[PDB]
Scaffold this active site. Structure first.
Site, PDB file in Angstrom:
ATOM      1  N   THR A 170       0.631  -1.168  -0.047  1.00  0.00           N
ATOM      2  CA  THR A 170       0.616   0.261  -0.179  1.00  0.00           C
ATOM      3  C   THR A 170       1.180   1.562   0.172  1.00  0.00           C
ATOM      4  O   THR A 170       2.306   0.692   0.963  1.00  0.00           O
ATOM      5  CB  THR A 170      -0.836   0.115   1.735  1.00  0.00           C
ATOM      6  OG1 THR A 170      -0.192   0.716   2.576  1.00  0.00           O
ATOM      7  CG2 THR A 170      -1.079  -1.383   1.655  1.00  0.00           C
TER       8      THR A 170
ATOM      9  N   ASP B 164      58.803  10.396  13.732  1.00  0.00           N
ATOM     10  CA  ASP B 164      59.969   9.601  14.519  1.00  0.00           C
ATOM     11  C   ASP B 164      58.676   8.519  15.374  1.00  0.00           C
ATOM     12  O   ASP B 164      57.733   8.663  14.872  1.00  0.00           O
ATOM     13  CB  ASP B 164      61.011  10.334  15.745  1.00  0.00           C
ATOM     14  CG  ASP B 164      60.979  11.664  16.133  1.00  0.00           C
ATOM     15  OD1 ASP B 164      60.038  11.192  17.044  1.00  0.00           O
ATOM     16  OD2 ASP B 164      60.811  12.019  15.933  1.00  0.00           O
TER      17      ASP B 164
ATOM     18  N   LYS C 127      64.059   4.373  14.066  1.00  0.00           N
ATOM     19  CA  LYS C 127      64.656   2.608  14.163  1.00  0.00           C
ATOM     20  C   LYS C 127      64.135   1.348  13.955  1.00  0.00           C
ATOM     21  O   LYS C 127      63.264   0.797  14.104  1.00  0.00           O
ATOM     22  CB  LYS C 127      64.214   2.865  16.034  1.00  0.00           C
ATOM     23  CG  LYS C 127      64.818   3.529  17.082  1.00  0.00           C
ATOM     24  CD  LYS C 127      63.735   3.779  17.651  1.00  0.00           C
ATOM     25  CE  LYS C 127      64.282   3.967  19.256  1.00  0.00           C
ATOM     26  NZ  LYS C 127      62.830   3.803  20.830  1.00  0.00           N
TER      27      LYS C 127
ATOM     28  N   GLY D 199      56.624  15.754  22.466  1.00  0.00           N
ATOM     29  CA  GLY D 199      56.908  16.224  23.318  1.00  0.00           C
ATOM     30  C   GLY D 199      56.976  17.858  22.263  1.00  0.00           C
ATOM     31  O   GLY D 199      56.258  18.323  21.607  1.00  0.00           O
ATOM     32  N   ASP D 200      58.195  19.044  23.043  1.00  0.00           N
ATOM     33  CA  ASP D 200      58.105  20.451  22.181  1.00  0.00           C
ATOM     34  C   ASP D 200      59.566  19.854  21.696  1.00  0.00           C
ATOM     35  O   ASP D 200      60.692  19.017  22.201  1.00  0.00           O
ATOM     36  CB  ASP D 200      58.419  20.967  23.586  1.00  0.00           C
ATOM     37  CG  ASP D 200      58.766  22.199  23.039  1.00  0.00           C
ATOM     38  OD1 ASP D 200      57.483  23.203  22.097  1.00  0.00           O
ATOM     39  OD2 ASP D 200      59.577  23.459  23.505  1.00  0.00           O
TER      40      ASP D 200
ATOM     41  N   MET E  22      66.033  11.030  29.619  1.00  0.00           N
ATOM     42  CA  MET E  22      66.309  10.574  28.830  1.00  0.00           C
ATOM     43  C   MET E  22      67.736   9.430  29.802  1.00  0.00           C
ATOM     44  O   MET E  22      68.742   8.655  29.117  1.00  0.00           O
ATOM     45  CB  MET E  22      67.699  10.303  27.834  1.00  0.00           C
ATOM     46  CG  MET E  22      66.759  10.700  26.783  1.00  0.00           C
ATOM     47  SD  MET E  22      67.460  11.553  24.914  1.00  0.00           S
ATOM     48  CE  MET E  22      68.207  12.536  25.502  1.00  0.00           C
TER      49      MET E  22
ATOM     50  N   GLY F 141      53.588   8.615  29.817  1.00  0.00           N
ATOM     51  CA  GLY F 141      53.162   8.947  30.428  1.00  0.00           C
ATOM     52  C   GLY F 141      52.136   9.317  29.412  1.00  0.00           C
ATOM     53  O   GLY F 141      52.328   9.447  27.530  1.00  0.00           O
TER      54      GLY F 141
HETATM   55  N1  LIG Z   1      55.564  10.417  26.262  1.00  0.00           N
HETATM   56  C1  LIG Z   1      57.212  10.283  26.780  1.00  0.00           C
HETATM   57  N2  LIG Z   1      56.722   9.019  28.019  1.00  0.00           N
HETATM   58  C2  LIG Z   1      58.014   9.491  28.689  1.00  0.00           C
HETATM   59  N3  LIG Z   1      58.873   9.765  28.531  1.00  0.00           N
HETATM   60  C3  LIG Z   1      59.484  10.514  27.880  1.00  0.00           C
HETATM   61  C4  LIG Z   1      58.435  10.727  26.606  1.00  0.00           C
HETATM   62  N4  LIG Z   1      59.055  11.434  25.564  1.00  0.00           N
HETATM   63  C5  LIG Z   1      59.455  11.504  25.730  1.00  0.00           C
HETATM   64  N5  LIG Z   1      60.367  11.377  26.821  1.00  0.00           N
HETATM   65  C6  LIG Z   1      61.668  11.337  27.861  1.00  0.00           C
HETATM   66  O1  LIG Z   1      61.986  12.052  26.400  1.00  0.00           O
HETATM   67  C7  LIG Z   1      62.838  11.436  26.069  1.00  0.00           C
HETATM   68  C8  LIG Z   1      62.698  11.515  24.551  1.00  0.00           C
HETATM   69  S1  LIG Z   1      63.864  13.243  24.117  1.00  0.00           S
HETATM   70  C9  LIG Z   1      62.021  13.939  23.906  1.00  0.00           C
HETATM   71  C10 LIG Z   1      61.928  15.144  24.613  1.00  0.00           C
HETATM   72  C11 LIG Z   1      60.110  15.710  24.308  1.00  0.00           C
HETATM   73  N6  LIG Z   1      60.588  16.815  23.652  1.00  0.00           N
HETATM   74  C12 LIG Z   1      60.362  16.604  24.767  1.00  0.00           C
HETATM   75  O2  LIG Z   1      59.561  17.815  24.709  1.00  0.00           O
HETATM   76  O3  LIG Z   1      59.419  15.922  26.352  1.00  0.00           O
HETATM   77  C13 LIG Z   1      62.519  10.128  26.000  1.00  0.00           C
HETATM   78  O4  LIG Z   1      63.659   8.874  25.827  1.00  0.00           O
HETATM   79  C14 LIG Z   1      61.808   9.727  27.008  1.00  0.00           C
HETATM   80  O5  LIG Z   1      63.043   9.539  28.298  1.00  0.00           O
END
Ligand SMILES: Nc1ncnc2c1ncn2[C@@H]1O[C@H](CSCC[C@H](N)C(=O)O)[C@@H](O)[C@H]1O
Ligand SMILES: Nc1ncnc2c1ncn2[C@@H]1O[C@H](CSCC[C@H](N)C(=O)O)[C@@H](O)[C@H]1O
Lengths: 448, 455
Positions: free
Chosen positions: A44, A248, A270, A299-300, A373, A402
């Site tokens: 329908t 990286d 690596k 990180g920075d 490190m 972390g």
């Molecule tokens: N996510 C993470 N957790 C724990 N340690 C970290 C990390 N990133 C970087 N690191 C520490 O820093 C090293 C890489 S050097 C890079 C550091 C990043 N540019 C910053 O500003 O934090 C790693 O071998 C570790 O020891």
């Protein structure tokens, strides 16, 4: 993803809808609006269908379901109040390898109708696979208001300049710049909206008569410690429009999933990890080609990343660059681990570090230490720290991954440092300082 | 409407891709994340394909386009740089009513691949019909930052609650407002992605337990040094879901323009009267009790000279859920925007963030700071610039040591001034707050790394 969205061109293409009620009517309204050659099979029909039927916009087949009615279709949709009849349609459709939807049964068949936000030629679709229909509706709502009612006009116009744009600029760099300047132009947007052709042409001509740059660039982008949420807005923006991204292993996959899909991706690690020099070279070579290079670093980039190294020659090379800071590991890890880097009297000095380094200075205190490190050197660190006078009772903490869903924090005291470090692998951050104390008075991220 | 958007189930469904280059590799990656039973036909393939093939991800058919290869196909994509070949793949796909995409010819075959925001099972797609690829990335981008990363989690999880939701909530509008609160509870979403079952139950319960209209919690969020671009996605996501925002003077006007139209704001900084910390801590705790989603917006980073811990140690029993979204701290920002990296090859082994003097309670450590291989970054030291010049070269720091100051870092009115330690106090009466004092040799790097405009 459990669904691949695609935008189909249904013009002059057969589609079948089984069912003639309200549900079927809503679907039919969508297919017609897409310009499909629609046929509707139902026991329908409700008024509407007839309206269309005598307006020659579709074909109606009254009567039970007929499997042969699918033989020339691209899309099938079962919308009857009868589930048995519906799967007869779905099964028929599958034998014919025709994508099919069973509206009241979202887990069945082979495709689901997403909610639509029309701004032709621009369109946005949202769906949850039938798992969160209230999630899709709320989203469509937020999206309806978020997209300007006339955004279509600009997109439409963009496609028409598409031809003159390629003939006016040699490179991708100028065209990529053209559109960027173009979709940011409000006078234009406004103009188009008021069908004021004079204002449109004036602004258009000027854009074409502009000397846009052809050279590429390299951008250092801090990806943060891992949690994709810690990427900056500007950072997301860079990887959202880069031609090639050099990352990286310290750049989390979640973060990688945010990169432009049609972009090149070079792994600089690596596999070794391409010495510094080999990484640097890649960059300037890619920018040289006039590409938008983005060096994604964890990180920075300026706090331990050879960020500077990667830039300190580009100016000699005439290559544009810029930096986008990111959350350092020490910043994120500390925060996610319930450990603030500074508190009321604790620290007036935060340290980021790394047969090595001034232990008497590091030993001192009313400071908080953060070693980047030092995992395979953790042992000698407590030996040196204790040696140069740091209280054995002094709390310390380690953070592996972390900010990630996989975060792991081990806790203890100087004397247990070396031991603890074995309870963790990389990447890990070591925090030494009285601030570690207030971890479970502030810990919010996880229990592991 | 010119294109009908539909969401296809490709898990273990035959799809063909013709081409073996990088354009082909992107379509395959996508088709693969969708679970397609993928066959790729091409003359030659790039490494990536052999990997996948050499790990049972897909099938390869090296050679010219085999039309029979579509016989049991559901989807096809023409990804070869040869238009004639593509044209053949398209003709072959239509001849048998198969949706086909021709990568370089958007309005050439059956369907167009949209830009995609993956929050599976929540998915958003954006397309302009090949008229504005650029407008699509712009939109992809905006949507990517607007949708938190784990949204999919709460989406998948809702079903397991749908039941309890009708039981407890009899009115449609009630159930709707519930889902509204549920879908923006990012803590829960994280607990789920964290596989933290306890917290999932803790949070799930609270949701039903608490009054419907209550969404009490406290979020410390780092605003960054100023640039609204240095805000984190999560931070923005939070700022858009705030009921109330407690913020201070160092939070940029531009960042504030991003806060929800009418979420109450509460200025707690210096006023043209200073607000006591315990009062601020108390507004946070108190307003979260009233069931409001509080967000303490902090300049830069929450735990870096921001007194962020205190504003939280007060929430350990009021029983109020809290989290912290770190931000780009002044050092990181001014460093990147001044061309002065905090670490460089040699120069590099101790970056030190230290406080100047409006923050006292003891006295400063001069020869600790005077060392030779660290990059000193002073916060709040503009008022002690001379007191730091004198007491630094006094403890051995080589006077020809490069120094710099960065005012309003990352902002459109950022100012950078530099030189030698023997000028610190002089270059300081050349800046105003807020600024940072950077002492270290890395400052010389700015000769090659400056890229941002100066004022
Ligand atoms: N996510 C993470 N957790 C724990 N340690 C970290 C990390 N990133 C970087 N690191 C520490 O820093 C090293 C890489 S050097 C890079 C550091 C990043 N540019 C910053 O500003 O934090 C790693 O071998 C570790 O020891
Ligand atoms: N955008 C900016 N540019 C330069 N210095 C800034 C800055 N924002 C903050 N600062 C420095 O930080 C001091 C306040 S202390 C708070 C710092 C903040 N928690 C952070 O993470 O950066 C200011 O007096 C100034 O010395």
């Amino acid at each position: 993803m459990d669904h691949l969205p695609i935008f189909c061109q249904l013009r002059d293409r057969d589609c079948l809808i089984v069912g003639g009620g309200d549900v079927a009517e809503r679907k039919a309204r969508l297919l017609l609006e897409a310009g499909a050659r629609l046929t509707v099979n139902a026991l329908t029909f409700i008024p509407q269908f007839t309206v269309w039927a005598n307006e020659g916009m579709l074909t109606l087949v009254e009567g039970p379901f007929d499997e042969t009615l699918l033989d020339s279709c691209w899309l099938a949709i079962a919308a009857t109040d009868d589930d048995t009849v519906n799967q007869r349609v779905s099964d028929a459709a599958e034998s014919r390898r025709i994508f099919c939807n069973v509206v009241d049964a979202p887990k069945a068949a082979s495709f689901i109708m997403p909610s639509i936000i029309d701004r032709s030629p621009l369109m946005v679709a949202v769906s949850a696979g039938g798992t969160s229909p209230v999630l899709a509706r709320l989203l469509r709502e937020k999206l309806e208001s978020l997209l300007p009612q006339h955004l279509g006009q600009v997109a439409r116009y963009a496609g028409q300049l598409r031809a003159r744009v390629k003939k006016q600029f040699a490179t991708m760099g100028e065209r990529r710049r053209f559109w960027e300047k173009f979709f940011v132009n409000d006078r234009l947007a406004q103009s188009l909206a008021n069908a004021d052709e004079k204002a449109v042409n004036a602004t258009t001509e000027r854009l074409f008569s502009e000397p846009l740059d052809h050279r590429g660039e390299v951008v250092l982008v801090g990806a943060g410690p891992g949690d994709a949420g810690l990427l900056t807005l500007k950072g997301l923006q860079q990887i959202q429009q880069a031609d090639i991204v050099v990352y990286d292993r310290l750049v989390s996959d979640d973060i990688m999933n945010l990169v432009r899909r049609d972009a090149d991706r070079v792994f600089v690690g690596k596999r070794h990890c391409v010495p510094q020099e080999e990484i640097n070279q890649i960059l300037l070579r890619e920018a040289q080609k006039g590409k938008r290079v983005v060096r994604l670093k964890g990180g920075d980039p300026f706090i331990f990343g050879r960020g500077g190294e990667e830039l300190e020659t580009l100016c000699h090379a005439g290559i544009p660059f810029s930096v986008v800071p990111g959350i350092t590991a020490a910043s994120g890890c500390s925060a996610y681990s319930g450990i603030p880097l500074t508190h009321r009297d604790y620290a007036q000095s935060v340290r980021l570090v790394t047969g090595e380094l001034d232990w008497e200075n590091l030993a001192a205190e009313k400071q908080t230490l953060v070693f980047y490190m030092g995992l395979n050197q953790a042992a000698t660190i407590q030996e040196k720290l204790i040696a140069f006078g740091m209280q054995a009772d002094m709390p310390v903490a380690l953070v592996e991954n972390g900010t990630s869903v996989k975060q792991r924090v081990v806790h203890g005291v100087l004397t247990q440092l070396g031991e603890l470090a074995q309870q963790v692998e990389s990447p890990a951050l070591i925090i030494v300082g009285r601030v570690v104390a207030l971890r479970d008075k502030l810990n919010w991220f996880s229990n592991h």
